[PDB]
Symmetry: none
Subunit: 134 residues, 2 copies
């Protein structure tokens, strides 16, 4: 099979979940400001961005960057590493995690899956409890 999904002009616009999931498996650093990781350029090119969501112990979810045009929250450091920035669309503040058992879920959105983010098809690429984040 092929690692990526291609559109009708053979431009890569997506990938199966397992592929996207595996590409984000190496986290260098996590904190309430965001995630630092190495992401392959060819993976970066198939994504429109990321959705950031806090989930409480009752399973209730809150999307922090909750509009279709607030998905662009990752950028590259001078050294090539990717920072997915929780603060950018959170009033430039770190995430507030009120209980260490709350979860921070980050989802990747592929270009073929791109006002709200509900209804956006997305790929869970990071999920940790507050006590497991910096």
């Amino acid at each position: 099979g092929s690692r990526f999904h291609y559109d009708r002009n053979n431009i890569a616009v997506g990938a199966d979940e397992s592929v996207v999931k595996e590409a984000h498996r190496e986290v260098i650093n996590s904190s309430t400001e965001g995630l630092l990781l190495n992401i392959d350029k060819d993976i970066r090119k198939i994504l429109s961005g990321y959705i950031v969501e806090i989930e409480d112990t009752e399973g209730l979810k809150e999307v922090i960057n909750d509009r279709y045009d607030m998905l662009n929250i990752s950028s590259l450091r001078q050294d090539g590493k990717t920072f997915i920035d929780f603060k950018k669309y959170n009033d430039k503040l770190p995430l507030y995690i009120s209980n260490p058992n709350y979860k921070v879920n980050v989802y990747a959105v592929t270009k073929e899956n791109t006002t709200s983010t509900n209804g956006i098809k997305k790929i869970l690429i990071f999920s940790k409890k507050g006590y497991e984040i910096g």
Copy 2:
């Protein structure tokens, strides 16, 4: 009161300046290549690293390792002592102190005060980082 400052996970991430300074007070060797000293593991754990600065007689200051991602100049050597390496981000050379009255200042940066990622303005400097002076000696006081 409490020796350390604790984060939302009840992990120590800082402390009052008096505690940090006191934990670095006793230096085994100071040279232009850096500082050798014993630091308590529990203090090491609350630090992101150190900023090294040369300060002339007129008070003009030069930070040697000036970036948010260059604080990591400390390590444990074979005997468990900490060595704060002045060469690491100094083009791999020892500090050049032009005049023996000039100072070398070293500041510690605690985890709660560290800069994890550059600002949205794209600033990668330590200017403005909150930091704690833990060593300040003139050239003639330095090996």
